[PDB]
Design a protein around this ligand. Structure first.
Ligand SMILES: O=C(O)c1cccnc1Nc1c(Cl)ccc(OCc2ccccc2)c1Cl
Ligand SMILES: O=C(O)c1cccnc1Nc1c(Cl)ccc(OCc2ccccc2)c1Cl
Lengths: 472, 472
């Protein structure tokens, strides 16, 4: 009766994930349509572009504080505490489940630099607990606490699996973050349920008729002959160490932002009298800084996070598109080539802004995750490094008198994986990024970058989830 | 230090793996040249083909018994015992290390259906212990016994990773087979060491000009558009279930062979007088049954295991080679198409023979593994199922007015991974075969097959390593 439990958990989690992503996509496309329809006057465009995300964030914060304040936060450190031995039976409730799902949907739909891995693992845990309660009516054997904890761990595995639609990588990431001593029985059960969840993904995508044909979400078409050369290994290692430092700095900045917000007595009081004003103000600041015909021309503000990542994972070299772009349509990568600034300038501005934007927006009293923003920052960093390597020498690396240009998409993949692993202190981001793209040709650079990033991060700073568990 | 320990462990283990593989390749190519030399007279080549493997196995058995009998066997169950608390200072000695390396090389060099997953990880354990002794001799700071067991686990990770040249999959396999409760810290250390070992392996492959550059071992060219169709999923499920049954049956047959051989009083007497005769007799039987112009024409007897697997994992469809043999060169796949028998008969005879051949040859008093033989049988079974599906569906399944043909190579991959996981009771064979083939297009079929095979195998029979630990 355990296998049917896992199958039901996977099915329900798959349905919840798909409906949430449909709602988020609808919200973003509605935002884009509203922005495009009011192009007659710039002031009306600015007013819409500012008020919309502010409205969504304010509504999300308000609904969460009315219904269930405990749902606010990432959700991974709380489950680490739960699996540590502290039982918060009140913290997994149906009201909290509704609050979490609606708040996460509305927060991600506003275009804020937020993630979804923590909220998704929390929702998966809640769904497992609720389904266990629902099946408890038929038999009281289900109330044995140890097996409930085991099934909660399996639920964390399922949640991380359905978040990225990467089953094995998700299970490994959940193993890495939610536990310290882990039984192989739980690994088997979690990967069992993640298999069925990923199968429901595929069958639903086929029955859904989403795109032109049945294709991948993060299509990568890198050549398999020479994905990378041997001379690029020092560059990949440098990316790894830099991402480790960046992850440690990101955790440090997030912790000091929380410390400043808590410590300043006058600021804290002025906030707690008008607690809804803080999310509105931060959304105001960010959305003002991301106005497409304002400052968003320097930050690719017309693209959402998924579009930004897809554009960054392109196989074309942007620096050399000045010669081989006469028989090809204008790619979406044009957003990274503003008329007055080169690609390097917009890349460095995007990094230097989105870093603090994500760090500050993670602390907002809304259900949010921190994986996706850091992943995007790492991908952009890797893309910048790859474009710099292409610009240094455009003929490529000489080898056997055969030409092969540098592919900066692999650099972006390596940078994203390294920065995410550095922030989360995990090694499973290497397996996740292969199942995401679908190509494992860059296994050597990704692994080398991830180990170096984790080593440096362990040398400097604790994990973001450990930071949360310590400050909360 | 720990980091330098892991670096040295990876370097030494990769060097040992490469030199052993070079020796095995030299032995096989010398045997092939000797066979080709005496083509004129059938009797002379028959005598050579029979005596050469017999000579190798008798020398291996004699050297192992004279030097260190403890090295005889797989090597994984004894390490499970070591990591279960019972530590014996007999299995880790320099003489045992020499005996193991020489015996394993000579046993794999004869073409016997043997693997390299068990002895090659016990070799890594020996290397870790020996280098730890070398460092302890230079200072009394290493007297602590608390620094070994985790380092032995890291050594098992490194060995299993370097066996397949699949670092992450190897680490996961070692986690699954060598432990029950395992901490993520040693996981991180093993991942670091395996990464550095893979880097050394690939840079060595570049320098010594064996292959062109850093590449895969079983490079495959499956198309990325539609690797599989949804109608093909039940076929993959059937492959998985049948592979689970086959793995349970293989374990059962191996155990019963051991029991019958050990129990019979007369056979025990012939053992205690003529122990060396048994490997010679079994090698006689197998090599007689695999004579290329004798019975080997029905079993691809001229193919060694590595190139057998390479031929099995090809992207071309053999059943339709009767119409598309005008624009392609004659491939090595012709060995599966003897003039008098069709492909299906060759596949079924090969399966029904190699099953018992591998099961019986695993019991031989020589250092051997059981992963590669079972993996080859699974790959052949998957290829048979894929070609059967192609015969059933001559034009494939046309979707949206377009035609995409069936690819039986993915079926072979799925079958190999499923039956290997069924035998070993492990789910990471999917990651192993992803890192081997280099394509993650078939993640869902192989994942479903591994799930089903492991489920059925656990339902009927214990794992092969558990069988060995119980009988021994
Ligand atoms: O960008 C959008 O408008 C969007 C629209 C529909 C669905 N998702 C979207 N973005 C998104 C967000 Cl915000 C958070 C998580 C996430 O999971 C994939 C992933 C990608 C990289 C790292 C870790 C997870 C996705 Cl795809
Ligand atoms: O066939 C040969 O003559 C040969 C020549 C050189 C090197 N290896 C050879 N074969 C071989 C053997 Cl016997 C055992 C292990 C193994 O590891 C790869 C592997 C492949 C599949 C599953 C698990 C491990 C290999 Cl490649």
């Amino acid at each position: 009766e355990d296998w049917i439990f896992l199958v039901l958990l996977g099915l329900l989690m798959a349905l919840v994930s798909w409906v949430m992503d449909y709602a988020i996509a609808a919200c973003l496309q509605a935002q884009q349509w509203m922005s495009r329809g009011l192009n007659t006057s710039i002031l009306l465009q600015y007013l819409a572009w500012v008020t919309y995300p502010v409205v969504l964030i304010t509504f999300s914060a308000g609904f969460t504080q009315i219904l269930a304040p405990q749902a606010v936060g990432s959700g991974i450190p709380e489950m680490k505490t739960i699996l540590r031995g502290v039982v918060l039976k009140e913290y997994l409730t149906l009201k909290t489940f509704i609050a979490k799902v609606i708040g996460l949907t509305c927060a991600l739909g506003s275009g804020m630099p937020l993630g979804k891995e923590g909220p998704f693992v929390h929702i998966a845990s809640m769904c497992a607990a609720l389904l266990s309660k629902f099946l408890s009516l038929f038999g009281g054997i289900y109330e044995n606490e140890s097996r409930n904890t085991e099934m909660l761990a399996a639920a964390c595995a399922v949640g991380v699996g359905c978040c990225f639609a990467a089953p094995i990588g998700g299970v490994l990431f959940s193993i890495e973050v939610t536990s310290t001593f882990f039984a192989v029985r739980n690994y088997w059960r979690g990967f069992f349920a993640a298999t069925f969840s990923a199968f429901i993904f595929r069958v639903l995508a086929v029955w859904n008729r989403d795109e032109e044909t049945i294709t991948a979400l993060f299509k990568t078409r890198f050549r398999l002959d020479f994905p990378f050369d041997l001379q690029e290994l020092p560059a990949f290692a440098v990316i790894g160490i830099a991402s480790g430092f960046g992850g440690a700095l990101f955790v440090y900045l997030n912790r000091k932002i929380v410390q400043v917000m808590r410590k300043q007595k006058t600021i804290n009081r002025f906030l707690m009298r008008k607690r809804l004003l803080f999310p509105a103000l931060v959304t105001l600041l960010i959305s003002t800084l991301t106005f497409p015909p304002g400052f968003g021309q320097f930050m690719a503000g017309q693209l959402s996070q998924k579009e930004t990542l897809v554009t960054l994972f392109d196989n074309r070299t942007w620096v050399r598109q000045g010669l081989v772009e006469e028989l090809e349509p204008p790619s979406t990568s044009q957003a990274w080539n503003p008329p007055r600034a080169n690609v390097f300038l917009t890349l460095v501005i995007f990094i230097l802004m989105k870093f603090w934007m994500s760090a500050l927006a993670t602390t907002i009293p809304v259900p949010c995750g921190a994986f996706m923003p850091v992943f995007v920052i790492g991908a952009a960093f890797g893309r910048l490094v790859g474009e710099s390597m292409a610009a240094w020498f455009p003929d490529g690396i000489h080898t056997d008198s055969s030409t092969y240009r540098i592919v900066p998409g692999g650099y972006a993949v390596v940078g994203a994986a390294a920065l995410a692993g550095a922030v989360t202190h995990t090694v499973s981001t290497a397996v996740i990024v292969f199942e995401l793209t679908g190509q494992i040709a860059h296994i050597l650079p990704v692994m080398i970058a991830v180990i170096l990033a984790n080593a440096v991060a362990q040398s400097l700073q604790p994990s973001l989830y450990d930071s949360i568990i310590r400050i909360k």
